[PDB]
Amino acid sequence: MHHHHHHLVPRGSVHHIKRRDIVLKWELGEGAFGKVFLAECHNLLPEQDKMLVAVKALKEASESARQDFQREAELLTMLQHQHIVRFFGVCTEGRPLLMVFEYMRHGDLNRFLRSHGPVAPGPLGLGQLLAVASQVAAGMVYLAGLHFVHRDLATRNCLVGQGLVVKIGDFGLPIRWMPPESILYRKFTTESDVWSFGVVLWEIFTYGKQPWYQLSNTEAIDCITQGRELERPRACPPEVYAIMRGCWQREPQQRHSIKDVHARLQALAQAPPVYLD
Ligand SMILES: CC(C)n1cc(C(=O)c2ccnc(NC(=O)Nc3ccc(F)cc3F)c2)c2c(N)ncnc21
């Protein structure tokens, strides 16, 4: 399950949290690897008595999922960046096994985009869309630097916190976000992650619409394999569509580097261009 991350070697140990220090509130969602709960966590940070956290409860026993749980926890503790979801540790005392993350109050970025279409309620402006995009790109620059291939970058896998802080996570094939080599040859690299970033930029600029929404799953596989490109969104300035096109070069080695994509988005976010649909 985590074999593609074998070159990543953990330094220190995973942080352990006592079960009685976690107080579950209510389910936030579930999906692939178990239920996720909002909870209060005690004695985690020396400054605060209690704080809000998101807790993932492992469903299996197993003991194949237990070995995978330990490796996953070792990898998550290695990821420390302003734009990567913050992992606090595990609770391994009894069943179920728990993973604890910093709570992000505004939830997933896909739902956030869809509810702020054409926190401060209302439509996100160009500056805000560029700030979201720049933050996701900053997280992807960090993962590329670590040689960590995400494999499922999409707005549904990003979280929004206080003050519109955006962080990348992975909550559980995502064919519509994949380049041809990933669909056809299962080749997942820093370059397939940059292609998925281009699709995330398209999601941001369409306010969370599904890529290839006009097509069935089969039609979308065929279109990606044939090389058809997603259309420029109405809210997307020409400068931003050029970034998307750079991410979508058919040849992986011709795609723009995430460092340059991030730097371009930084320049545009600190600007932004005078564009009106
Ligand atoms: C949308 C709801 C239900 N939700 C999920 C929250 C999580 O943080 C969460 C849930 C389950 N697994 C992970 N795993 C993870 O992110 N792994 C991971 C991270 C970076 C990376 F590059 C690769 C990775 F595999 C984290 C969450 C929150 N923290 N706040 C609010 N809602 C949350």
Take residue 84 and report the two structure tokens written for it: 């990567």
Asked whether the beta carbons of 235 and 129 are under 8 A apart, the reply is: yes
Q: What is the CATH number of domain 1-103?
A: 3.30.200.20
Residue 193 annotated among the catalytic residues of the structure: no
Phi, psi torsion values for 3, nearest 5 degrees:
-55, -35
- What are the pocket residues of ligand 1 if the criterion is a CB atom closer than 6 Å to any ligand atom? 28-29, 36, 54, 56, 76, 79, 84-85, 101-104, 107-108, 143, 150, 159, 168-171
Distance 186 CA to ligand 1 centre (A): 24
Cα–Cα distance for residue pair 213/77, rounded to 1 Å: 36
CA distances 211 to 90, 135, 214, 215, 220, Å, are 35, 21, 8, 9, 9
Cα distance between residue 194 and residue 137, in whole Å: 9
Instruction: For ligand 1, pick from 85, 88, 98, 162 the residue to mutate: most ligand atoms within 8 Å of CB.
Output: 85
Return the ligand 1 atom nearest residue 34 CA: 11
Closest by Cα among 170, 175, 172 to 149: 170
- Name residue 108's beta-bridge partners: 159
Per-position b or e across 183-218, b if 16+ CB within 10 A of its CB: beeeebbbbbbbbbbbbbbbbbbbbbbebbeebeee
Measured CA to CA, the distance from residue 2 to residue 188 in angstroms comes to 13
The backbone torsions φ and ψ at residue 26, rounded to the nearest 5 degrees and listed phi first, read -160, 160
Domain ranges of the chain: 1-103, 104-277
Q: Specify burial of residue 100 (Cβ count, 10 A radius: 0-12, 13-18, 19+).
A: buried
Resolution (A): 2.1
CA distance 107 to 198: 22
- The values of phi and psi at residue 199, to 5°, are -65, -40
CB 100 within 8 A of CB 57: no
One DSSP character per residue, the chain reads --GGGTT----SPPPB--GGGEEEEEEEE--TT-EEEEEEEESSSTT-SEEEEEEEEP----SHHHHHHHHHHHHHHH---TTBPPEEEEE-SSSS-EEEEE--TT-BHHHHHHHT-----SPPPHHHHHHHHHHHHHHHHHHHHTT---S---GGGEEEEGGGEEEE------GGG--HHHHHH----HHHHHHHHHHHHHHHHTTSPPTTTTS-HHHHHHHHHHTPPPPPPTT--HHHHHHHHHHT-SSGGGSPPHHHHHHHHHHHHHS------
Query: Which token pair is 191?
Result: 């370059």
> For residues 194 and 247, what is the distance between their CA atoms, to the nearest angstrom?
6
Distance of CA 236 to the CA centre of its chain: 21
Number of CB atoms found within 10 A of residue 50's CB: 14
Q: Rounded to whole angstroms, how far apart are CA atoms 2 and 13? A: 18
- Cα Rg of the chain, angstroms: 19
Which candidate, 131, 39, 23, 135, places its Cα nearest to that of 85?
135
CATH code, residues 104-277: 1.10.510.10
CB contact at 8 A, 167 and 86: yes
Residue nearest to atom 32 of ligand 1 (CA): 107
> Which residue's structure tokens are 């890529």?
211
Residue 6 neighbours by CB under 8 Å, 6+ apart? none
- Rounded-to-integer distance, Cα 224 and Cα 222, Å: 6
Residues 35/57, Cβ–Cβ less than 8 Å: yes
Q: What are phi and psi of 44, to 5 degrees?
A: -85, -50
**Cα 225 to Cα 179: distance, rounded to the nearest angstrom:** 8
Structure determination technique employed: X-ray
How many CA atoms lie within 13 Å of 195's alpha carbon, on the beta-carbon side?
Answer: 31
Among 21, 49, 68, 152, which one carries the catalytic annotation? 152
- Residue 143's closest CA among 156, 130, 157, 131? 157
